[PDB]
Amino acid sequence: SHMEQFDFDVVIVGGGPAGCTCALYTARSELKTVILDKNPAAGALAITHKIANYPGVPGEMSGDHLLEVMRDQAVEFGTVYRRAQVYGLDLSEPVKKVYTPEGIFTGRALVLATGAMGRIASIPGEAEYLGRGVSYCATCDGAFYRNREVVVVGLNPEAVEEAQVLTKFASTVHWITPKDPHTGHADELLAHPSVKLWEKTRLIRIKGEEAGVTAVEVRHPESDSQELLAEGVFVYLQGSKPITDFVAGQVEMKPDGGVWVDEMMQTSVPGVWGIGDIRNTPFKQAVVAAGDGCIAAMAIDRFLNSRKAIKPDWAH
Amino acid sequence: EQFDFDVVIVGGGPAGCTCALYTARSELKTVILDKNPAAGALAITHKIANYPGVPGEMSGDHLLEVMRDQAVEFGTVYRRAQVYGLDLSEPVKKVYTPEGIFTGRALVLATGAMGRIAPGEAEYLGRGVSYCATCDGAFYRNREVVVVGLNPEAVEEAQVLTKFASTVHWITPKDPHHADELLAHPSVKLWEKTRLIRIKGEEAVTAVLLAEGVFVYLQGSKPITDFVAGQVEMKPDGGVWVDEMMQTSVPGVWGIGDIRNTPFKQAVVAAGDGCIAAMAIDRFLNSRKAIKPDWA
Ligand SMILES: Cc1cc2nc3c(=O)[nH]c(=O)nc-3n(C[C@H](O)[C@H](O)[C@H](O)COP(=O)(O)OP(=O)(O)OC[C@H]3O[C@@H](n4cnc5c(N)ncnc54)[C@H](O)[C@@H]3O)c2cc1C
Ligand SMILES: Cc1cc2nc3c(=O)[nH]c(=O)nc-3n(C[C@H](O)[C@H](O)[C@H](O)COP(=O)(O)OP(=O)(O)OC[C@H]3O[C@@H](n4cnc5c(N)ncnc54)[C@H](O)[C@@H]3O)c2cc1C
Numbered sequence: 001s002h003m004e005q006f007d008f009d010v011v012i013v014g015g016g017p018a019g020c021t022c023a024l025y026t027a028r029s030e031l032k033t034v035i036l037d038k039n040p041a042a043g044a045l046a047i048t049h050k051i052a053n054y055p056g057v058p059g060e061m062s063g064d065h066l067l068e069v070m071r072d073q074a075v076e077f078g079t080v081y082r083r084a085q086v087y088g089l090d091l092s093e094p095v096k097k098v099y100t101p102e103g104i105f106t107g108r109a110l111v112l113a114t115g116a117m118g119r120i121a122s123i124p125g126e127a128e129y130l131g132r133g134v135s136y137c138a139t140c141d142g143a144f145y146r147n148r149e150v151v152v153v154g155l156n157p158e159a160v161e162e163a164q165v166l167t168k169f170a171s172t173v174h175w176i177t178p179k180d181p182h183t184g185h186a187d188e189l190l191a192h193p194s195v196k197l198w199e200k201t202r203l204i205r206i207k208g209e210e211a212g213v214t215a216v217e218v219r220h221p222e223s224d225s226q227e228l229l230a231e232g233v234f235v236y237l238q239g240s241k242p243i244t245d246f247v248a249g250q251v252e253m254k255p256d257g258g259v260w261v262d263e264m265m266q267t268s269v270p271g272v273w274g275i276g277d278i279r280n281t282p283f284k285q286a287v288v289a290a291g292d293g294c295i296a297a298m299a300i301d302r303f304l305n306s307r308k309a310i311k312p313d314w315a316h
Numbered sequence: 317e318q319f320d321f322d323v324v325i326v327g328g329g330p331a332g333c334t335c336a337l338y339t340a341r342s343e344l345k346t347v348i349l350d351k352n353p354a355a356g357a358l359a360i361t362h363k364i365a366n367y368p369g370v371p372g373e374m375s376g377d378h379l380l381e382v383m384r385d386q387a388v389e390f391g392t393v394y395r396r397a398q399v400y401g402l403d404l405s406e407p408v409k410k411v412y413t414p415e416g417i418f419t420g421r422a423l424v425l426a427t428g429a430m431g432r433i434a435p436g437e438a439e440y441l442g443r444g445v446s447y448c449a450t451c452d453g454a455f456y457r458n459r460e461v462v463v464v465g466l467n468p469e470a471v472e473e474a475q476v477l478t479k480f481a482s483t484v485h486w487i488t489p490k491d492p493h494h495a496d497e498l499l500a501h502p503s504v505k506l507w508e509k510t511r512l513i514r515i516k517g518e519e520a521v522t523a524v525l526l527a528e529g530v531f532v533y534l535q536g537s538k539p540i541t542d543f544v545a546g547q548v549e550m551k552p553d554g555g556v557w558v559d560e561m562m563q564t565s566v567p568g569v570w571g572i573g574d575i576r577n578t579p580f581k582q583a584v585v586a587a588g589d590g591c592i593a594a595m596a597i598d599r600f601l602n603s604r605k606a607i608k609p610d611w612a
């Protein structure tokens with residue numbers, strides 16, 4: 001049913017170690033929990049090749065293997081894991097609404113756990129044309145570009161999957177990569193007739209008229225840049241900034257850009273928590289992110305059950 | 317037997333072990349001073365199922381063993397030693413154990429919250445009552461002593477006292493049936509199903525059965541802070557107070573894990589505390605402007 005699929009006690013945005021640990025604890029509290037994860041390969045832990053300082057996990061382990069263990073634990077105890085990119089929130093009421101292309105999820109408690117693989121929109125025109133042709137969510141905006149020209153910037157798992165989303169609609173998908181993509185999964189993407197590869201090309205500028213983007217300026221390997229007509233530009237370059245765009249300035253931020261939280265990981269908005277590297281503390285380690293998620297889950301259990309005290313989850 | 321270290325960590329639970337793992341990986345000479353590896357909260361947990369990244373069935377002391385092994389693999393020195401006192405009055409902190417005086421540029425308090433508040437027990441602290449048999453054992457040669465409790469610390473501590481006392485009167489709430497080694501000693505008198513009503517003594521303990529030393533090893537839920545003797549600020553709830561980087565009111569001294577007595581008493585939270593402290597310690601000891609993450 002609609003209520004079964006979309007209405008939860010706890011909605012967690014982001015499935016890195018913070019979000020998965022939070023879900024493990026809320027699910028073990030028998031709170032109906034969903035993780036909305038845009039791409040399990042895009043988080044900081046998932047891209048770590050070999051993690052050797054996660055306490056309790058010895059030997060050689062890849063980050064994406066460690067994360068898979070954590071995700072499987074959360075699901076084992078009842079978490080619903082969904083591939084879904086959150087692009088907006090309505091935080092003004094006791095029931096929070098969470099907007100994805102897969103539908104609107106609702107939660108009595110909301111957890112922001114999207115990490116800090118983001119970047120400031122530094123390409124000239126990029127900030128200027130946000131919402132007017134510049135986008136970071138192909139599953140949300142792809143359908144608006146049926147039979148239109150689009151540009152995808154970046155070489156990483158997210159860019160490849162988002163480019164494939166856009167091949168379902170666009171007349172042409174211009175893929176701008178800094179290096180040779182052959183370095184599958186590229187093969188599958190490059191097999192789409194609409195994909196045009198621009199290897200070793202840099203995106204110089206995004207331009208348009210008042211109505212929105214009309215072209216990009218690019219420089220590929222001769223002293224003179226060229227203009228490429230396009231109406232949608234999807235940029236998937238990785239950075240070190242907290243991923244907070246979809247929050248639309250609705251929670252307080254520290255001067256460093258991270259989400260501000262109190263001692264129980266609660267943001268400035270009641271019923272909304274922030275955990276892991278979205279907080280942009282200096283202590284960017286997987287076990288610290290996991291600890292944040294645990295604290296938030298314990299605070300959420302007290303809040304949703306109106307308990308007098310935090311209740312630890314102890315084996316006896 | 318070196319006693320000088322860059323970082324001294326008091327307590328080898330998940331907080332202390334994680335801290336050591338990170339400071340050692342930072343190339344800081346690190347020692348863990350652990351009174352009993354079986355006495356921490358994680359070590360007594362029979363099956364932990366909510367430590368993220370460790371699926372399936374695991375005993376608490378096996379999880380701790382992995383963490384301890386990780387810290388040592390990257391260079392930590394692990395020592396069995398009970399801290400009974402501290403000198404924090406100088407930049408190099410001094411840590412007193414029966415095994416010697418350890419010193420460190422940075423000190424970490426990581427003793428957890430298996431402690432208990434003091435039946436006349438408090439009145440006689442330091443005269444008759446004691447909580448460190450490795451410190452006071454020699455003082456009770458050929459004297460009657462009482463040991464209270466059935467747990468890893470009590471059995472090990474009772475065996476220490478058999479080396480000196482004329483009689484070891486062991487008060488247990490239930491049948492002890494490492495107990496076999498202890499009960500085989502001729503000086504051990506077992507008082508099963510016996511509860512200690514009170515402690516009585518003179519100005520100089522004298523009884524509770526006549527005795528002169530009473531060693532109480534009952535488990536509780538209170539932060540273990542007696543050995544700090546009020547030298548760092550404590551929260552109204554009894555926990556050690558720390559700032560955002562886990563630093564106490566004394567610069568160069570950190571507090572991590574359940575010694576802080578926050579409501580969030582979970583192994584992964586304690587481990588996270590230890591990581592934060594280690595990163596702050598690395599910045600402090602190298603006079604860095606910024607925290608340096610440890611990334612592969
Ligand atoms: C190169 C590198 C190496 C590292 N090495 C180590 C190491 O050795 N040891 C260690 O302890 N730490 C290491 N770290 C740090 C550690 O990986 C991070 O601190 C930790 O992963 C942060 O956890 P997090 O869950 O907050 O976020 P992340 O792990 O980044 O996960 C965030 C999740 O949110 C999702 N997401 C983002 N936006 C949205 C959205 N709008 N809607 C839905 N889902 C969304 C992403 O897809 C991702 O799955 C490393 C980091 C980097 C960048
Ligand atoms: C019955 C019970 C069940 C639990 N179940 C779970 C669970 O299922 N999941 C979970 O996440 N958490 C659980 N916990 C909580 C978790 O175990 C604790 O929060 C965590 O162990 C605290 O870690 P810590 O390092 O701060 O200290 P501890 O793990 O208590 O360790 C402290 C260490 O310091 C040593 N020490 C003490 N005094 C001194 C001294 N004077 N000098 C030197 N060394 C000293 C001790 O010997 C010990 O080695 C449980 C706790 C209890 C009590």
Ligand SMILES: [Ca+2]
Nearest residue numbers: 262263559560
């Ligand atoms: Ca704080």
